[PDB]
Design a protein around this ligand. Structure first.
Ligand code: AKG
Ligand code: MN
Length: 219
């Protein structure tokens, strides 16, 4: 649960039907206009990764359409935003209960982007900061809220671009991870996808392919 100031991991936060619904909506959004593509560049490097944005588009920074094909991203489903807000509320309640030092509290989020990352089993994403948001967003420490579904990721995090100084946590299917405030500019990334770790009920009900779906909400 508490990983460092303003960084909370909510285990198995996503409900059954919400996990299925997320996958089904992403499968459909993923094949249409503004769907998944293989990025030519990601800060930190990458392997076996495809992405698509909902809300604002995030290109190699932010815009209304993808330059390479002109497609407008699908908007962020209202259910996704609701679950983001619930995660932030639950984290703030936890932080209030944990207070001994200042009381910690994460800023609210009204996300206008969702980056959807899909990793196959050989997937990885190198260490980087989420630093492309506007200066006021960053200065306010508005959090990043990350959903995990499917196979488990080994997620690295730390203060610098060196794995030797990074911590590791597993992000398992259903987990929501939040980093804001003093943790907003952590270096972070995905070192490994653990094969064959997605819950069977999810693979079966959502017809989920091998790998991991991440949704990362910001601004
Ligand atoms: O897949 C993850 O959990 C990391 C997502 C991420 O850091 C990003 O795409 O900016
Ligand atoms: Mn990131």
């Amino acid at each position: 649960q508490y990983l460092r100031p303003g960084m909370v991991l909510l285990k198995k936060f996503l409900k059954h039907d919400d996990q299925v619904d997320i996958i089904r909506r992403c499968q459909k959004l993923g094949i249409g206009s503004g769907g998944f593509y293989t990025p030519g560049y990601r800060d930190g490097g990458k392997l076996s990764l495809q992405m698509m944005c909902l809300g604002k588009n995030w290109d190699p920074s932010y815009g209304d359409t993808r330059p390479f094909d002109g497609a407008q991203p699908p908007s962020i489903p209202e259910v996704f935003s609701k679950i983001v807000k619930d995660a932030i509320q639950a984290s703030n309640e936890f932080l209030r209960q944990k207070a001994r030092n200042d009381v910690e509290e994460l800023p609210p989020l009204s996300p206008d982007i969702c980056l959807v990352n899909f990793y196959t089993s050989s997937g990885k994403l190198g260490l980087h900061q989420d630093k492309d948001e506007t200066k006021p967003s960053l200065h306010k420490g508005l959090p990043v809220v990350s959903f995990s579904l499917g196979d488990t990721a080994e997620f690295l995090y730390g203060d610098v671009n060196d794995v030797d100084k990074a911590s590791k946590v597993d992000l398992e299917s259903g987990d929501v991870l939040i980093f804001g405030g003093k943790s907003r500019l952590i270096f972070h990334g995905v070192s490994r996808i653990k094969p064959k770790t997605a819950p069977n009920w999810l693979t079966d009900e959502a017809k989920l392919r091998p790998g991991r779906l991440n949704l990362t909400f910001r601004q």
